[PDB]
Design a protein around this ligand. Structure first.
Ligand SMILES: *C(=N)[C@@H]1C[C@H]2C[C@H](NC2=O)C(=O)NCC(C)(C)[C@H](NC(=O)OCc2ccccc2)C(=O)N2C[C@H]3[C@@H]([C@H]2C(=O)N1)C3(C)C
Ligand SMILES: *C(=N)[C@@H]1C[C@H]2C[C@H](NC2=O)C(=O)NCC(C)(C)[C@H](NC(=O)OCc2ccccc2)C(=O)N2C[C@H]3[C@@H]([C@H]2C(=O)N1)C3(C)C
Lengths: 305, 305
């Protein structure tokens, strides 16, 4: 037993990380087959970043201006192109460590692992959620851009995130691997602000199911509710509305525990209205919303890759 | 910015994981050079585990009784021996993926990454502390034993933990890689209990320094204290006594922030006596003690491997 915020094993992604330098700017790239994907702001001077014209800036860049290094060894760049907010650098060598992979654009409320990198070298791994407001709560410094987020389904790596920037509240914005931002963010150093940080209601319920599976049971009550009744409470606390689709996704955890989703909603309602009275659930003194139903089942059943 | 519970990249360890079966029992092993290390209770029937005589049980086991599988391929066992609570299986092939490695017995209050495995296959990665009471708060199911804990110093993997068992409170006990338990635990299914779960005081202070570095500053106060004065408060709250050695280890974080360790102790004292008044620090509503000073510096400076 026990329940931890748990990342995917990072080895398959570590083998894809490279360093990309253009002029004096160095960040990370992802090497898959004969392509290196990296944030297009590698071509910018610090000054360019205030108001960049990326197409105009790219005119001045040739293949040889892109220095790509895989550990200690230089890759030869034989082509380049911009797709949305990412550059694709064609190199003369297919990455021999390329795993089975897909590009996916994840939905808000889904989780993924981040392999934080600097100079093409991995620093660490942690789990994040795509928040309803299309930000993530990461850990990123100067040089981290091009660090990616991913999921693994047995042998297949689904890349869903590439790191580009930080907003106030120290939250993080970036793109899918087609270079399209999550949310309304742009890759320019100008005032941008995150919207309301809504709580992922279905994830809080999944985590309450994890707590029950682990014998943390004190918050189970004698009450039930309805979707509409619960949602009137959700709304006051900036929780996402719960739908029948959410109830259906919680079906495995409801079946394993014998607790109806609406009974668990009645427990959640009491926790939102009364707080936790200085008690903990799975060692937390707040309600956790960065575990998906699938994360709880994966962790509680010991699914491997 | 941002501050996350962050594991080491797991790739170097993933390449060392194998499956070990003896009779009907399957667990994980660690393959380094031509040796596979695994928990000795692989040789036990469920019934044996109530009161095992490991030397007597091992008489009945030969090299061929140890089925070792590295992904899909069988390793040939050419020798076996018991060292404390681990078996060492000599195989006819040196692991071609062996990293630069050391075995270290960590001190209580130090952190490490766990690569949770089942059937020799990685499930996930998370960060743990060796708690003062010589347990860890992990996430382990049936089949997880032989999962290891480690640190990386640039290219060198320091293995410090091998998973053996679960105690009440759903906490975890195991050995160093010489097969010596942390704490007084034995590898027998008989009533054993964890001692008092003391808080790692130096780690809480390190995390308060991380919060300041991140602009979470509300808890800084107008007060200072002394070691002896602070420690009279520590003791009531089951905090480890703070020593000058702890103060010296916090020197980098004190110097970076300009906040004297004793001033931060005065802030900690107010938080212990008054609580957090429903406020958060780095998104937590409790004081976090599983980041070491070195973890905070590593994360806040972007150290790579
Ligand atoms: C990638 N290597 C880098 C990522 C990190 C820099 C650091 N945290 C990161 O995630 C950080 O301090 N980032 C904040 C700054 C100001 C540097 C901007 N953010 C930004 O401009 O957001 C809009 C804003 C502007 C002014 C005030 C408030 C909000 C930032 O992250 N970046 C500016 C520049 C690149 C990016 C960056 O440094 N990425 C791009 C957006 C092109
Ligand atoms: C390794 N494959 C396995 C690890 C896991 C089993 C699971 N969690 C684990 O970490 C679990 O439920 N473990 C608890 C049980 C009861 C199975 C024992 N713990 C134990 O005996 O602790 C002492 C105790 C006895 C009775 C009541 C209270 C405490 C346990 O973990 N194991 C029994 C047997 C191996 C180990 C195990 O299953 N490891 C060994 C200790 C030889």
């Amino acid at each position: 037993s026990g329940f931890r915020k748990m990342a995917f094993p990072s080895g398959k992604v570590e083998g894809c990380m490279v360093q990309v330098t253009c002029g004096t700017t160095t960040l990370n790239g992802l090497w898959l087959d004969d392509v290196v994907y990296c944030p297009r702001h590698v071509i910018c001077t610090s000054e360019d970043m205030l108001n960049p014209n990326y197409e105009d800036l790219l005119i001045r860049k040739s293949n040889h201006n892109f220095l790509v290094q895989a550990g200690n060894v230089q890759l030869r760049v034989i082509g380049h192109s911009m797709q949305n907010c990412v550059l694709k650098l064609k190199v003369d060598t297919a990455n021999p460590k390329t795993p089975k992979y897909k590009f996916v654009r994840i939905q808000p409320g889904q989780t993924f692992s981040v392999l934080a990198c600097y100079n093409g070298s991995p620093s660490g791994v942690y789990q994040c959620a795509m928040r309803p407001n299309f930000t993530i709560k990461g850990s990123f410094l100067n040089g981290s851009c091009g660090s990616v987020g991913f999921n693994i389904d047995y042998d297949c790596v689904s890349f869903c995130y590439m790191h580009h920037m930080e907003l106030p509240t120290g939250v993080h914005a970036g793109t899918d691997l087609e270079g399209n931002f999550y949310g309304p963010f742009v890759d320019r150093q100008t005032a941008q602000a995150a919207g309301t940080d809504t709580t992922i209601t279905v994830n809080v319920l999944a985590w309450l199911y994890a707590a029950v599976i682990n014998g943390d049971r004190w918050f189970l009550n004698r009450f039930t509710t309805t979707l509409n009744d619960f949602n009137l409470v959700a709304m006051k606390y900036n929780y996402e509305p719960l739908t029948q689709d959410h109830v259906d996704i919680l079906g495995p955890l409801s079946a394993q525990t014998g607790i109806a989703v609406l009974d668990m909603c009645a427990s959640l309602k009491e926790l939102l209205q009364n707080g936790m009275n200085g008690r903990t659930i799975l060692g937390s003194a707040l309600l956790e919303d960065e575990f998906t139903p699938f994360d709880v089942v994966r962790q509680c059943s010991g699914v491997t890759f």
